[PDB]
Amino acid sequence: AVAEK
Amino acid sequence: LPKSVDWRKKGYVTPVKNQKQCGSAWAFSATGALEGQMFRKTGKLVSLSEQNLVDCSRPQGNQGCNGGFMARAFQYVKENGGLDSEESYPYVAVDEICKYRPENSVAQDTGFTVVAPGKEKALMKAVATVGPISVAMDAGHSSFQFYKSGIYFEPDCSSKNLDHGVLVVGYGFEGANSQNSKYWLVKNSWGPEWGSNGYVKIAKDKNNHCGIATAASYPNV
Ligand SMILES: [Cl-]
Ligand SMILES: [Cl-]
Numbered sequence: 001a002v003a004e005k
Numbered sequence: 006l007p008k009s010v011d012w013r014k015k016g017y018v019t020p021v022k023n024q025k026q027c028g029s030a031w032a033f034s035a036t037g038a039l040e041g042q043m044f045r046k047t048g049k050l051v052s053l054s055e056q057n058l059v060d061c062s063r064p065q066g067n068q069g070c071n072g073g074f075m076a077r078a079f080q081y082v083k084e085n086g087g088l089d090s091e092e093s094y095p096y097v098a099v100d101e102i103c104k105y106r107p108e109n110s111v112a113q114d115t116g117f118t119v120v121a122p123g124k125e126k127a128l129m130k131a132v133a134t135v136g137p138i139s140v141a142m143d144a145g146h147s148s149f150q151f152y153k154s155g156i157y158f159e160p161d162c163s164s165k166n167l168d169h170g171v172l173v174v175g176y177g178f179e180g181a182n183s184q185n186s187k188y189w190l191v192k193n194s195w196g197p198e199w200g201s202n203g204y205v206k207i208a209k210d211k212n213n214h215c216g217i218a219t220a221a222s223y224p225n226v
Contacts, residue, residue: 001144001169003195004025 006133008183011175011190017041017136018174019052021203023196027070027098032058033194034139034170035078035224039088041136042226043112051111054094061085061103069100075139075170079117079224088112113226120221123164125210128189128218129176137174137192141220142207144169152200156188158208162215173217176209189217 012018019040024030032055044050059069062081067073082088087110094104120138121127131138143163156179172192179186187209197203208214 001030002024002026002028003144003150003199004023005196005198 006129009175009177010133011177012041012137013174013190016050017044018172018192019050021192021197022055022096022194024055024194025098027059028068028072029055029059029070029098030194031067031073031075031170032078034172035075036088037172037174037192038075038137038139038222039079039082039112039114039224039226042114042224045136046226052091053112054089054091054096056091056096056101057089057094057103057105060101061105070098073170075141076117076119076222079114079222082112082114082224083116086110086113114224116225117222118225120218120223122219122221123213125213125218128173128221131221131223132173132176135223137172138221138223140171140173140191140217141167142169142171142191142215142217143167144171144215149205152205154201156186156206156208158211158214164213164216164219167216167219173221174204177206191217 036053065077089109093109175190188206
């Protein structure tokens, strides 16, 4: 899953 | 087995990375596990190339920024003969041309070992005896996106339908009693700003919470 920063 | 384990304290783990807007967590989980094993074998910690996995492992079943599996990445490294360093094959978070160069390889594997599915005690044995372990989990929750402290527990978590690859670097417990308030130490790939410096404590021996022992594996070096 993605969500980065 | 030990009451607690933390491979970060022994030099096995690289700083936290950031996958950005690319579905490549499976590649970061696999490089994390290979980085541990190469350190156990040689004494040298070298950051490995997720981009090499993203661009080159389509034949094995991976889909780049659209998803993949850690076992398929270890299969690629075995069939390929090698894996490049992050320095030589940098991360750009998009699908690109395979640029694998044997002269820049800093890692190899002969296959991989699977942890028995569903078994948190089998996962505990592998973490204690081997090093960091690749694992799948259900991370699709706002509570996980905004995690900051504490032992993570989410009722909505599934132990069977998973969507994210991470790295188990250890396990521990709160308190003086080693037999309760247990947790898995997990390295994510959403940057050091996410979570607790890029890490999360996931509830341990609470019925395979979020699927951490459902599909666990490690490379054989
Ligand atoms: Cl896998
Ligand atoms: Cl920390």
